[PDB]
From a paper:
Applying these values to the 3D refinement resulted in a map of 4.02 Å resolution, which further improved to 3.45 Å after several rounds of CTF refinement. Our atomic model reveals that each subunit consists of an N-terminal β-strand (tail) followed by a globular (head) domain. The head domain contains two β- sheets composed of 11 β-strands. On the subunit level, one β-strand is missing to complete the sheet, leaving a gap between β-4 and β-12. Upon closer investigation of the assembled filament, this missing strand is replaced by the β1 tail strand of the next subunit along the filament (n+1). In the thread, the β-tail from subunit n, extends further into the subunit two positions along the filament (n − 2). β;− 1 of the subunit n is partially buried in the subunits n − 1 and n − 2, further adding to the stability of the interaction. Threads appear to be covalently interlinked by a non-canonical isopeptide bond between Asn57 of subunit n and the N-terminal Asp24 of the subunit n + 2. Along the map of the S. acidocaldarius thread, we found dead-end protrusions that did not resemble the protein backbone or side chains. These protrusions were exclusively found at asparagine residues N56, N80, N83, N121 and N146 of each thread subunit. Connected to each of the five glycosylation sites at the corresponding asparagine are two N-acetylglucosamine (GlcNAc) residues, the second of which branches to bind two individual Mannose (Man), Glucose and one 6-sulfoquinovose molecule. Whereas the threads have a rise of 31.6 Å and twist of –103.2°, Type I pili have a reported rise of 7.7 Å and a twist of 115°.
The model archaeaon Sulfolobus acidocaldarius assembles three filaments of the type-IV pilus superfamily (archaella, archaeal adhesion pili and UV-inducible pili), as well as a so-far uncharacterised fourth filament, named “thread”. The filament is highly glycosylated and consists of subunits of the protein Saci_0406, arranged in a head-to-tail manner. Saci_0406 displays structural similarity, but low sequence homology, to bacterial type-I pilins. Thread subunits are interconnected via donor strand complementation, a feature reminiscent of bacterial chaperone-usher pili.
Residue numbers in the entry:
A (entry chain I), B (entry chain H), C (entry chain G), D (entry chain F), E (entry chain E), F (entry chain D), ...: 24 to 206
């Protein structure tokens, strides 16, 4: 039995993150400063700014908006896109109708709008088109429009969960909408 | 003292490689065309396509993906398998949690997924089962999921090293998972 | 002129060979069963198992391994050693960097490793120390690590030749590493 | 009828042998110490060291070497040569291709090489040139390279016979290559 | 008492010897030039070439050959034969098995071979057939094959004695094998 | 002065000789047929077979033998003996050591041996004992053993002379050894 | 005519003979005992011992000797001499060369030698000198040396005749050599 | 009766004897000097030389010779002759065959020979012819040849007697042979 | 005295003598022819033939014979006889022993023998018997045998004398022997 072996050598280094999530990045007090409302939101950036974890409460309102719950610092101009969104709910009925995540400029103008959930299902065209972001600091906000009539009378903490993946390519040319493989 | 001598004669020739690594093999511009991102990856095929050497930077993201960093041309249908993987890191803490190397079709469908490192250790079942590859050109990609909190603030170039060996048997019948002996 | 003549009489008989090379010796189908890969190896035992002749092709891989290309039946426990190795190549540059011949057990564990060529030259300590082999059947395999960059683009059949001599002494005591004289 | 008678008187005495064959001569354990391998060689010196008789077995190997099967003690510096070699075989086909008898120094360096049989026939130039040997003790060894394919499957004890005569002249001047007359 | 007396008168003259033994006869340096090896042979022609006296030493060899120990000049073509051989030995056991005296041409071809002793006894047919010798110069040599095992360890000078008589008739017709009467 | 005269009358007649010397007597070609070797002997019977005259040449041999140089026909059984032998030599040194005259049967068996000269002197007991000869034909031969070293280099014809007298008594009773008186 | 007559008277008596011939005189068996060889001699003493008559045969021998054919008894010491010898032969050629008559002592020593015929003629000095003989008994013998070549092939009885006269004077003083007158 | 007487007167004188017998006549010692051999002859001249008386002994010899037994002196030249011879013997057989009386010269030459007895009888012609004798001295001798076989064994002194008469006429002319008358 | 005278007358005549002595009577030369030997006899007839006178010499011979000294012629037949003989000698001893006178016939036969002296004395019977003589002529001779030893050494002429008388009677009848008277 003839075997030919092919050797690949990978030497892994480390570079400052192109984009990262934070609370008040680079000392800017207007960029991510509502991640700790005592009884309604609690959002923290993941270890080393790799992501954000947010506990959110929706409260029988037609629009539940969470403004400036994290800040996104894009150190180098690159191309961002929404890679994958997963939504699972534990209630009998679907609690969330619409869910959108907004990246806004420092003055509150929407730079990119990301429709996480439309009409109770996750966005079919998951790997959205890579679009360009300039270096700077941006606000991120979340709007959730629920199905009224579904929210339980007794409060809960796991009505639903939404996981979002954002791809950033720090390249000159816009890359194809490459999806995220399962490790 | 009686001695019997047994003479073996080996006449060594040369044959075109069954599989080989390249950048854009056979002029196909969609097969290995991201081996030179200016500041994040630098991957080159070894002399005569015997392997690949890649410098990679991981950057505080939950998934660090390097798509299409080399192309694999399999000139003849054969059986491929992962033979041996070695991983050594120079940092105090383990920088890499998961590391997977994907061989994908030209359209981005995963043909074979090779888990180089799972949960910070190298894959116990090293000589994976030989599986069949048809002749053609394929993309290879690398996904590295780090331990966040371990990546140093100051950049480096030898945080870790991963060496991979792939065995290809150009035979009709699938061979046993023969390991690679030390020369 | 006085001459004294001394007469020696040698009567030559015949005994079964202590060790011999074969393909599937004694009907064991796991001992030498890869001596005929259609386009990459062709290994045959010499007349009456006195040795082996193998045409091998090396193919731009970092390790070219030829597993189970012959079987060695050692009918009686004796002492084996590598007696002499000669290597001549016809190409301008040296094609072979390392060349090792492995004698392995039926389960693929290396019993003795014989470094035919190290770093492009033949092993300086040619008459290796006689070591003991028990009666049984063993696999033999060859690993060739070439100098990449030297292999010609157009295939050939006499890139190089390696001739190996193995000495077997079928004695109770280990003999000195007796070399093989030129007839 | 006239007859003239001429009377010759020869008075025969006795002198220690100039050279003689032995096993471990003069107590030297490194000079002739392999004349009794249990199943492969049995070599004994003739009565009073006048010659050697050896039963040898050849065993399907490309070189069958019998090292140190006798010792030669040359008590006085003289001139040695090969006088006559006769070879007769009882098998249908010739079993022996090459047969050489080596006289080597105590350290295994070949002093004189005597080609008994070359390519299946006895050496045409039988009375080889007398060459000088200094007083001392020397090893003698035999190498037989058979015609593989001719050795019988069932063992035998008279496959062939080789008788060798060595002439030693204990004189200051080298004698002519005097042949051995038939008594 | 009648007595008749018959008177015979013999007048004795002298003629050059028909054949005679010598060392280098007639200045020919290739005819009898080994009658004085310092420690192994000492052969001298008898007074006036009537015969030869040789002290010989036999030395534990299977053939003890004494080449060119005397020269025979046959001035006139005649008929030679072996007349009488006597052998007496002083050792307990017979030291000599075979003893042959060779008359050879100048080029070393055997003209006549005279078996003095065969298998330890003197040749039964003592008065051998007269055979013709042409005028010229010839070599004489002696081969003694001993009984090994009989030669004493301590050297001696009268182990045995062999006396030979050669009859030469210088006549045209071959004479009958006339024996030598005791004076 | 008284004188008495005594007259004796002897009438002398003639009888066939009892014994006589001849060449081939009575037509027997085996009885005296070597009396004329061209250059070495010339023997003739005396007038009427009363004796023999022989010119003989001795030639540097240890035994000079002259076989069948005369024949003796004894017509009537009688008693023969050697009566007187005289030897005179003309050389400075004695040329003849031993000289014996043999009377042999037709088959070559010695009937009577007559030692003419022993050790250079003539036989002291000259009138040897009369011994009986039967009627028939007999060979006579002469053996001369010279003093080597005395024979001259240049040939001669009167080196020495030996005269022999044989007495034959044709009587029934053996006579006393009557000597031969000087006429 | 005056005549004077002178008368002489002789009275003749008789005395024992001083010397006489006989066969075995006085019983002595060693004195005259070969007067009757059957075919070669026949000698008888004359009547009363006055002389001897002998028929003799000469037989082609160089010396024809007739020993002890008569005995001479000399009773009284006297003086003997040869008086007259007459020789006549009937053959064409002279048959007798020498003829001598010997008077010998009892021990065979010659007392007086009488040359009857010398070289074919009778002795010129016929009346030899009277020499003294002592009383006793003596042998007489005859030697005849013939002319070989003259003796006839066919035997005869009167080839020749020799008559001898011996004078004996029985006196004290030696007489003159008185010859024998014709009666 | 007439008677006439005639007277003759003779006057007788005396003259010296013409011839006479003697012993050594006239002092000549060579003329008659053997008349006294002690035991064989005794001859004396008669008184006054008138004759001789001799006792003679004959002794078994073929000739009995008595030399010089008397001397005859013839003083005057005269004529001598034998006148009468008488022979008588006393033995049975005749003892004397021949008897001759010789008158010889002083030198032993026979002057006259007188045959007294021929063949046993006395000479028939008794008065022999007167022959002349010159004056001088002469020897006389007697030869007697007996009949052997007749002589007696015991000696005697009168075997026979012979008487002789010699007539001498001292005259100038030879007388007739006058016989001697009986007185 | 008467006387008667008687006268006788005798007339004497003369007659021729009847017998007479002579020398050569009647011319017969054979009858008396030795009467004159010069020195030994001298005989002459007496005057007229009456007798004879003879001088005779006797000479030491045993018989002294004087033959034919006279002749007797008897003219007439008558009777003769010896009448008287007288013998006288003058020597001391008798010189004559015998003396006889013979009358013989012409042929020498004795007619009558007359013994004058016998044994030294004269014949006793002197007148011998007359015997008859016939007419004729006769010889007369004298023989004298002397006494040897008596004859004188010196010669003489009258040693003795003998005278003889012969009577002749010329008558027819024989007369008586008449003696001769003295005148
Ligand atoms: C297996 O490994 C083998 C190693 O030798 C490879 O053989 C080499 O192939 C080269 C071309 O390969 C490229 O192109 C083919 C398509 O044709 C693709 O399949 C490959 O993926 C790859 O992209 C070739 O390089 C050059 O060759 C030509 C010169 O002969 C040149 O025109 C071409 O444009 C290529 O660039 C190798 O050829 C030899 O090249 C060396 C230079 S180098 O080693 O290539 O850099 C030349 O040496 C020069 O010689 C001159 C004197 O002539 C000297 O003065 C100077 O010092 C020296 O540089 C040789 O002359 C030239 O022959 C070729 N190697 C050999 C030994 O032939 C093989 O492709 C590998 N297999 C695969 C599938 O890639
Ligand atoms: C040492 O070297 C020896 C060289 O002779 C070898 O001896 C030979 O063994 C052969 C069989 O060996 C095979 O099988 C054994 C198990 O039995 C294994 O241990 C071996 O590893 C090996 O796989 C044998 O070959 C054939 O022999 C039979 C015929 O006798 C046949 O039925 C078998 O099926 C084998 O194929 C050799 O035998 C001789 O074979 C030759 C043909 S060939 O040389 O083998 O190709 C025959 O010649 C034919 O003869 C006919 C006339 O009879 C001719 O007309 C024709 O022209 C000719 O081809 C012989 O007749 C036949 O005897 C056998 N060699 C000898 C000389 O006996 C030995 O095995 C070696 N040692 C080892 C351990 O392998
Ligand atoms: C040339 O050929 C010669 C042939 O005779 C050799 O002579 C023999 O040497 C023997 C010893 O040689 C060995 O040792 C020497 C060192 O000393 C080495 O150089 C040699 O290479 C060799 O290894 C000798 O054998 C024995 O001799 C001793 C007895 O005398 C004994 O103590 C020793 O230990 C040896 O074993 C030969 O001696 C004779 O030996 C025979 C027995 S045998 O023939 O050796 O086997 C004895 O016969 C015995 O006698 C008894 C009565 O005594 C009998 O009852 C019995 O039946 C019988 O066996 C002899 O008695 C004994 O003398 C010796 N041969 C002779 C004739 O002396 C010579 O070595 C050769 N040359 C070389 C260089 O090797
Ligand atoms: C047959 O046997 C014969 C025996 O006599 C031999 O005769 C002798 O030949 C000798 C020479 O022979 C050699 O040379 C010839 C070639 O010429 C070869 O064919 C022969 O093979 C052989 O090699 C000869 O010896 C010497 O002779 C010369 C002197 O005459 C001398 O110059 C030479 O150089 C030789 O060396 C024999 O001659 C006699 O020699 C003795 C000495 S010896 O006996 O030779 O050693 C001399 O005696 C000396 O005399 C002196 C007084 O003169 C004394 O004072 C002294 O004491 C004494 O030594 C003689 O004088 C000398 O004549 C010669 N022998 C005779 C008797 O002549 C013959 O060669 C034999 N046949 C063959 C074919 O070889
Ligand atoms: C000298 O010559 C003489 C010649 O007569 C020799 O005298 C004869 O001697 C005879 C014996 O001589 C032998 O013996 C003596 C020793 O005694 C030796 O010395 C001799 O050498 C010799 O050998 C003698 O012969 C025989 O005599 C005996 C008889 O008397 C007799 O017994 C003996 O045995 C002898 O044989 C001669 O004697 C006479 O012999 C004749 C016979 S014959 O003549 O001898 O043959 C007899 O005649 C016979 O007589 C009878 C009548 O009686 C007749 O009837 C018959 O016809 C007749 O034969 C005589 O009677 C006898 O006397 C003897 N001769 C004489 C005459 O006496 C003498 O020996 C010589 N000298 C020497 C030294 O030998």
């Amino acid at each position: 039995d003839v075997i030919y072996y092919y050797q690949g050598q990978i030497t892994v280094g480390n570079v400052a993150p192109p984009m990262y999530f934070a609370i008040q990045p680079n000392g800017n007090a207007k960029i991510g400063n509502n991640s700790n409302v005592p009884s309604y939101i609690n959002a923290q950036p993941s270890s080393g700014g790799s992501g954000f974890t947010a506990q959110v409460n929706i409260t029988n309102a037609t629009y539940n908006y969470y403004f400036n719950f994290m800040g996104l610092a894009v150190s180098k101009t690159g191309y961002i896109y929404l890679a994958k969104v997963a939504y699972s709910y534990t209630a009998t009925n679907n609690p969330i109708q619409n869910a959108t995540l907004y990246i806004m400029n420092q003055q509150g103008q929407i730079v990119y709008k990301y429709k996480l959930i439309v009409n109770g299902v996750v966005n079919s065209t998951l790997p959205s088109t890579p679009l360009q972001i300039n270096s700077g600091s941006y606000i991120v906000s979340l709007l959730i429009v629920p199905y009224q009539g579904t929210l339980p009378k007794t409060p809960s903490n796991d009505l639903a969960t939404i996981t979002v993946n954002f791809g950033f390519s720090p390249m000159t040319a816009s890359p194809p909408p490459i999806p995220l493989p399962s490790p």
